[PDB]
Amino acid sequence: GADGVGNSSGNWHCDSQWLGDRVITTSTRTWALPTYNNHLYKQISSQSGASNDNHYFGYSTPWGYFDFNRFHCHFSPRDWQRLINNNWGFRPKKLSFKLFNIQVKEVTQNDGTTTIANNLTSTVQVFTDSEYQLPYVLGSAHQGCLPPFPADVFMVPQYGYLTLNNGSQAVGRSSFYCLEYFPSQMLRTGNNFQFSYTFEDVPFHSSYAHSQSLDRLMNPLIDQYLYYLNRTQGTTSGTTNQSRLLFSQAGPQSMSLQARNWLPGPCYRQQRLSKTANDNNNSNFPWTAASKYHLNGRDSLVNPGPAMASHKDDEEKFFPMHGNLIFGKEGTTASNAELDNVMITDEEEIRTTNPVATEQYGTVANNLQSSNTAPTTRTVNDQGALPGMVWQDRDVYLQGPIWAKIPHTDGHFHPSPLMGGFGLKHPPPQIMIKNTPVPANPPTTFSPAKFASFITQYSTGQVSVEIEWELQKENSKRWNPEIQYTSNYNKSVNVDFTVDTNGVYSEPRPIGTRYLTRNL
Ligand X SMILES: Nc1ncnc2c1ncn2[C@H]1C[C@H](O)[C@@H](COP(=O)(O)O)O1
Q: Which is nearer to ligand X, 71 or 319 (CB)?
A: 71
| Of positions 422, 469, 497, 515, contacts ligand X by CB under 6 A | 422
Contact between residue 88 and residue 473 where contact means Cβ atoms under 8 Å apart: yes
**How many Cα atoms occupy the beta-carbon half-sphere of 229 within 13 Å?**
5
Residue 301 near ligand X by CB under 6 A: no
Given ligand X, its own copies, none, residue 416, with its beta carbon under 5 to 8 Å by kind, binds ligand X
Q: Which is nearer to ligand X, 412 or 473 (CB)?
A: 412
Q: What does the DSSP 8-state code read for residue 235?
A: S
Given its own copies, ligand X, none, residue 496, with its beta carbon under 5 to 8 Å by kind, binds its own copies
3-state secondary structure of 380: strand
Given ligand X, its own copies, none, residue 202, with its beta carbon under 5 to 8 Å by kind, binds ligand X
Given ligand X, its own copies, none, residue 415, with its beta carbon under 5 to 8 Å by kind, binds ligand X
Q: Quick one: CA dihedral 472, 475, 481, 482, positive or negative?
A: negative
Instruction: Write the burial class of residue 36 (CB in 10 Å: 0-12 exposed, 13-18 middle, 19+ buried).
Output: buried
CB of 203 to ligand X, least distance (A): 5
Residue 439 near ligand X by CB under 6 A: no
Backbone angles phi, psi at 73, to 5 degrees: -75, -20
Given ligand X, its own copies, none, residue 437, with its beta carbon under 5 to 8 Å by kind, binds none
Alpha-carbon gap, residue 103 to 6, rounded angstroms: 11
CB of 38 to its own copies, least distance (A): 25
| Interface stretch with ligand X, choices 217-225, 310-318, 412-420, 468-476 (CB under 6 A) | 412-420
Instruction: Write the burial class of residue 343 (CB in 10 Å: 0-12 exposed, 13-18 middle, 19+ buried).
Output: middle
Given ligand X, its own copies, none, residue 422, with its beta carbon under 5 to 8 Å by kind, binds ligand X
Residues 267-286, interacting with ligand X (CB under 6 A): none
CB of 394 to ligand X, least distance (A): 11
Given ligand X, its own copies, none, residue 414, with its beta carbon under 5 to 8 Å by kind, binds ligand X
Q: Quick one: CA dihedral 460, 462, 468, 471, positive or negative?
A: positive
| Of positions 206, 416, 430, 513, contacts ligand X by CB under 6 A | 416
Contact between residue 350 and residue 214 where contact means Cβ atoms under 8 Å apart: no
Which residue from 507, 499, 483 is spatially nearest to 397, judged by alpha carbons?
507
What Rg, from alpha-carbon coordinates, does the chain have? 29
Size of the residue set binding ligand X (CB under 6 A): 8
Alpha-carbon gap, residue 253 to 260, rounded angstroms: 15
Residue 317 near ligand X by CB under 6 A: no
| Of positions 423, 427, 461, 512, contacts ligand X by CB under 6 A | 423
CB of 320 to its own copies, least distance (A): 20
CB of 276 to its own copies, least distance (A): 21
CB of 271 to its own copies, least distance (A): 25
Q: For the CA atoms of 260, 261, 264, 266, what is the dihedral angle to 10 degrees? A: 120
Contact between residue 418 and residue 323 where contact means Cβ atoms under 8 Å apart: no
Cβ-based neighbours of 427, under 8 Å, separated by 6 or more: 136, 138, 139, 403, 404, 405
The contact mask relative to ligand X for 180-219 (x = CB under 6 A, - = no) is: ----------------------xx----------------
What's the residue count for the chain?
520
Q: Which is nearer to its own copies, 180 or 382 (CB)?
A: 180
CB of 332 to its own copies, least distance (A): 22
DSSP 241-270: -----EEEE--SSSTTTS--S-B---EE--
Residue nearest to ligand X (CB): 423
Residue 415 near ligand X by CB under 6 A: yes
Alpha-carbon gap, residue 274 to 299, rounded angstroms: 25
CB of 151 to its own copies, least distance (A): 5
Q: Which is nearer to ligand X, 328 or 415 (CB)?
A: 415
| Interface stretch with ligand X, choices 115-123, 328-336, 409-417, 495-503 (CB under 6 A) | 409-417
**How many Cα atoms occupy the beta-carbon half-sphere of 288 within 13 Å?**
3
CB of 371 to its own copies, least distance (A): 33
Q: Which is nearer to ligand X, 203 or 439 (CB)?
A: 203
CB of 438 to its own copies, least distance (A): 16
Residue 292 near ligand X by CB under 6 A: no
| Interface stretch with ligand X, choices 129-137, 147-155, 354-362, 407-415 (CB under 6 A) | 407-415
Output the CA–CA distances (angstroms, integers) from residue 351 to 209, 213, 216, 320, 484, in the order listed.
9, 8, 12, 14, 19
Contact between residue 321 and residue 270 where contact means Cβ atoms under 8 Å apart: yes
For residue 279, the one-letter residue type is D
Given its own copies, ligand X, none, residue 423, with its beta carbon under 5 to 8 Å by kind, binds ligand X
CB of 517 to its own copies, least distance (A): 5
3-state secondary structure of 73: helix
Give the residues lining the site for ligand X (CB under 6 A): 202-203, 412, 414-416, 422-423
